[PDB]
Amino acid sequence: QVASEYLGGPGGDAFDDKALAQNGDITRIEMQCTDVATYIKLRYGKVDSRQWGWANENCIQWSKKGVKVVHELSSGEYITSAIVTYGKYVQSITFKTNKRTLPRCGTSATEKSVTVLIPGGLKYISGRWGCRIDGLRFHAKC
Amino acid sequence: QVASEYLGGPGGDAFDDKALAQNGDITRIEMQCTDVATYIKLRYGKVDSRQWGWANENCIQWSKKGVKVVHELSSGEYITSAIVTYGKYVQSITFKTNKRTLPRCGTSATEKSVTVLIPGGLKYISGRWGCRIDGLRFHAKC
Ligand SMILES: OC[C@H]1O[C@H](OC[C@H]2O[C@@H](O)[C@H](O)[C@@H](O)[C@@H]2O)[C@H](O)[C@@H](O)[C@@H]1O
Numbered sequence A, B: 001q002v003a004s005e006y007l008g009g010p011g012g013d014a015f016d017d018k019a020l021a022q023n024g025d026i027t028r029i030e031m032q033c034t035d036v037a038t039y040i041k042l043r044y045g046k047v048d049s050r051q052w053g054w055a056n057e058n059c060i061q062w063s064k065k066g067v068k069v070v071h072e073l074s075s076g077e078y079i080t081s082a083i084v085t086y087g088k089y090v091q092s093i094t095f096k097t098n099k100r101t102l103p104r105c106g107t108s109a110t111e112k113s114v115t116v117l118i119p120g121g122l123k124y125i126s127g128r129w130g131c132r133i134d135g136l137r138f139h140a141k142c
Helices: A057-061 B057-061
Strands: A013-016 A026-033 A037-044 A067-072 A079-086 A090-097 A113-117 A122-129 A133-140 B013-016 B026-033 B037-044 B067-072 B079-086 B090-097 B112-117 B124-129 B133-139
Touching: A026 A122, A037 A090, A037 A122, A037 A133, A079 A122, A079 A133, A090 A133, B037 B090, B037 B124, B037 B133, B079 B133, B090 B133
Parallel strands: A113 B112
Antiparallel strands: A013 A122, A026 A037, A026 A067, A079 A090, A079 A113, A122 A133, B013 B124, B026 B037, B026 B067, B079 B090, B079 B112, B124 B133
8 A cells, every 4th residue: 555645734524535446446537626626526436435525505605616527537547646736725636647637626726736646546535625625645556 | 657757858868777676676876966966876676777977077067066975775765755956957856765854966956846756665767867867757666
């Protein structure tokens, strides 16, 4: 088991997709994206996780909601890196796969930025969520 | 395996330690360091690479030379982060391991900076070299 540092802060509630990943490779990314990323929801084989973020419509009181973005992954497509900007929360995420680069979720990229290599491809994520994505940790197929 | 983007420029000649890295984990880092890093040379298990940089002493016409810096890694110690400043060439390299942060090689850090995280540890480097380190790419273990 290989995993990155946790990137983000202590708000929200912890989540962990470890068990759900026993379904198989990530086949889809769903996010909600505005000036910042407000939720993430990956699909492991055929099974989605819960929506990790945008806990309720009342969250408009603290950030914009944004637009739902989906990337359906093709067979043999694996997420191999993530550019993350973060501070108190995850601000923006830019995934790259072994087949293509994907657009950034979160138009603002002003906080500290790191490029996380994800050896063997991303296996699953853990982190913290509430009205947005408080933090993420990337667990690799290695 | 998964790799970072290529950081640097198109000068020099390509090198790639992939085949050498079959000989083992990185056990040693050697660099030549002045205001910029002028060469890099890793050891994989017991097997040293060629000196990637400072092709000859007349290279002093185009940059300073620097001092030789050796870091021996303990068993189970691996490089989990590389902060690189770069443009036309690699300017500076700051390696962090799971045990300690190593000093920057290259006292000047004025060029574009990137922080590459390598969960599980760096496996090997590739890049381009001549009088100095034209560029580097970081390869993970899977
Ligand atoms: O590795 C750097 C560089 O090394 C050799 O070039 C040395 C210098 O050549 C001068 O002609 C030039 O004006 C300088 O900019 C170069 O640093 C090597 O031949 C070259 O390919 C490399 O980029």
